[PDB]
C-alpha cells in the first residue's frame, strides 16, 4: 500500500547461520516468481540482478541505487523510474549517473542497484479521475488531502488568506532564507510561469 | 504557358527528392532544381603562387586547390550572373558550353 512499485519477497540463504533471510526488494520490469536473483560483484547482467555500479557497463538502466555503499538503496525507487549510468571514473572509484530529475550525480563504485526499470510503470499516465480515487490514494499514505488553498483561508490561518477578494496580495514567491510560516506559496522560485516558454 | 519540357527540374518519376538551401539567400530548393557549380579554385591568386614558392622551405610545392559545391537557387543565380535568360528556341540547348 502507498506505493505503486511492487515488492518481491526475495529470499537468500544466510551463509553464516542456517536460516533463510527474507528481504523486501522493489520489483523490476521482468522479474517473476521463482526467478533467481544474483546479487553481488560477480553477478551477471540480467533484469533483477543486483550489481555494484562499477562492474555494470556504461549506458545501462539501473534502479534502486545506493547513494553511498551500504545505504540499502536510495535512488529511483518510484514506479517506472530508473537511473542511467552515463560514465565511470575508475581512478577515483566513483561512477557518474543521470538521475530521474535529470540531474547528473557522482556515485561510489561500491554502491549498487538492481537492473531494469522499476515495475508499476505508467501509473501517472491514467488520471485518478475522481475524488474517491484520490482519497483512497492518500488514505494509505498520510493525511495530506484535501489541500485547502491558502487564499480561501482567513488571514490568521495562512499568509495568503484574507481580503475582500480571493487574492494573494504579496508576491507568491517566497525567499529561501525565509522562516517557517513564510514559506507558503512558491519557495525560492528561480523562474516562475510556464516551462517551455 | 508551359515554358519547359522538364518543368524546371531534373526530376522524372519520383514525386520528391530533397530540399537544399542556397549559399546566398538560404532558400530551400530541390537539389536537382539547384544550379550546381563545382567551383574549383586555389586558396591563393593566380599571380600569387610565385611568392609562396619563394616563401616556402618546400622548393617543390603542391599548389593546393580547394573544392566547394555552390548550390544556387535560380533567383540568386540569375542575379549573380551564374545563368542567363536564353532564347526560347535556344532554351533547349542543354550543352554546358
Amino acid at each position: 500500500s502507498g506505493r505503486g512499485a511492487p515488492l518481491a519477497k526475495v529470499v537468500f540463504r544466510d551463509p553464516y547461520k542456517y536460516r533463510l533471510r527474507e528481504e523486501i526488494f522493489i520489483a523490476n520490469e521482468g522479474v517473476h516468481t521463482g526467478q533467481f536473483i544474483y546479487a553481488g560483484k560477480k553477478a551477471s547482467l540480467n533484469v533483477g540482478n543486483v550489481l555494484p555500479l562499477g562492474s555494470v557497463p556504461e549506458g545501462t538502466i539501473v534502479s534502486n541505487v545506493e547513494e553511498k555503499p551500504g545505504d540499502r538503496g536510495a535512488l529511483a525507487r518510484a514506479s517506472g523510474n530508473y537511473v542511467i549510468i552515463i560514465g565511470h571514473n575508475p581512478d577515483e572509484n566513483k561512477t557518474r549517473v543521470r538521475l530521474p530529475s535529470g540531474a547528473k550525480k557522482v556515485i561510489s563504485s561500491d554502491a549498487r542497484g538492481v537492473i531494469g526499470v522499476i515495475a508499476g510503470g505508467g501509473r501517472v499516465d491514467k488520471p485518478l479521475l475522481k475524488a474517491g480515487r484520490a482519497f483512497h490514494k492518500y488514505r494509505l499514505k498520510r493525511n495530506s488531502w484535501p489541500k485547502t488553498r491558502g487564499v480561501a483561508m482567513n488571514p490568521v490561518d495562512h499568509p495568503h488568506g484574507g481580503g475582500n477578494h480571493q487574492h494573494i496580495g504579496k508576491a507568491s514567491t517566497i525567499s529561501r532564507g525565509a522562516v517557517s510560516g513564510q514559506k507558503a506559496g512558491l519557495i525560492a522560485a528561480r523562474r516562475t510561469g510556464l516551462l517551455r516558454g | 504557358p508551359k515554358k519547359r519540357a522538364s518543368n524546371g527540374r531534373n526530376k522524372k518519376g519520383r514525386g520528391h527528392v530533397k530540399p537544399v538551401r542556397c549559399v546566398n539567400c538560404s532558400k530551400s530548393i530541390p537539389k536537382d532544381k539547384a544550379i550546381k557549380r563545382m567551383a574549383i579554385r586555389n586558396i591563393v591568386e593566380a599571380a600569387a603562387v610565385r611568392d609562396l614558392s619563394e616563401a616556402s622551405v618546400y622548393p617543390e610545392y603542391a599548389l593546393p586547390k580547394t573544392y566547394n559545391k555552390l548550390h544556387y537557387c535560380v533567383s540568386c543565380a540569375i542575379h549573380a550572373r551564374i545563368v542567363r535568360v536564353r532564347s526560347r528556341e535556344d532554351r533547349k540547348n542543354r550543352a554546358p558550353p
Binding site: - | M38, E60, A62, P64, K65, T66, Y67
Partner: protein
C-alpha cells in the same frame, strides 16, 4: 603591460622512433613556476603535423598526423601517436562525380586497452576500354566490398599493437591489401584508410614510452 612572450622556455617535441627525424617543433607554454609546474600544463596537449614533414617525402603530403605529448624530458617532449586525418584538400580532391565511393568503418581495439576507430575510403574506377559515362557500382558489390574491407581492417588492428600498426602503415601496405582482396569484385581508384580516432588509453607504461624514445 606585461609582455607575454618573455615568460616561456620554448619546449620542444619528440616523435615516436618509428617515424622519420624525431624532432618536430618548439612550442611555448610558460616558465615552470613554483605553484603550477610546466610539466602538468604541457601534458594533455595535441599537435597537428604533416606526414610529409614526418617522412620527408612529398608522397605523404596528405594524411596529416595528430600527436599527443606524454612525458616532458626537460624542454624535449616525447609523444604518442594520437590520430591521422586526410587534409581537407585531398578528400575534396579525390571525390568527383560519376564515380561511386565506399565508406567503410570498423570499431576495433588494439591488442592492449588502447582502442581506436579505423576508417577506409574507396572509389570506383574508370575501367580500361570501358565506355559507360559514369561506371557506378551495383550497391551489392558495395555491401560485399565493405565486408571484405572491414574484414581486412578488423584482422589488422586486432593483430598488432599501435606501434606495430604505424610502423607497418607508413609504407602503405594496408591500402594495397584492400585492393588485392577486391580485384576479384570491382576495381577501385582511391583506396586509403583515411582516418583514425583514438578513444581510450591504458596505463601509460613509461617502459613502453621510453622504448620509442631512447
Amino acid at each position: 603591460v606585461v609582455d607575454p612572450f618573455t615568460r616561456k622556455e620554448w619546449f620542444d617535441i619528440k616523435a615516436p622512433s618509428t617515424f622519420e627525424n624525431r624532432n618536430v617543433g618548439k612550442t611555448l607554454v610558460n616558465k615552470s613556476t613554483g605553484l603550477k609546474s610546466a610539466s602538468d600544463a604541457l601534458k594533455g596537449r595535441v599537435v597537428e603535423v604533416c606526414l610529409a614533414d614526418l617522412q620527408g617525402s612529398e608522397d605523404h603530403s596528405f594524411r596529416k598526423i595528430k600527436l599527443r605529448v606524454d612525458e616532458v624530458q626537460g624542454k624535449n617532449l616525447l609523444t604518442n601517436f594520437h590520430g591521422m586525418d586526410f587534409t581537407t584538400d585531398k578528400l575534396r580532391s579525390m571525390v568527383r562525380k560519376w564515380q561511386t565511393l565506399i565508406e567503410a568503418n570498423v570499431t576495433v581495439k588494439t591488442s592492449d586497452d588502447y582502442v581506436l576507430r579505423i576508417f577506409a575510403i574507396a572509389f570506383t574506377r574508370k575501367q580500361a576500354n570501358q565506355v559507360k559515362r559514369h561506371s557506378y557500382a551495383q550497391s551489392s558489390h558495395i555491401r560485399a566490398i565493405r565486408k571484405v574491407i572491414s574484414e581486412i581492417l578488423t584482422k589488422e588492428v586486432q593483430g598488432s599493437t599501435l606501434a606495430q600498426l604505424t610502423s607497418k602503415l607508413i609504407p602503405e601496405v594496408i591500402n594495397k591489401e584492400i585492393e588485392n582482396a577486391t580485384k576479384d569484385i570491382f576495381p577501385l581508384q582511391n583506396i586509403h584508410v583515411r582516418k583514425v580516432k583514438l578513444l581510450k588509453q591504458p596505463k601509460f607504461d613509461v617502459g613502453a614510452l621510453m622504448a620509442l624514445h631512447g
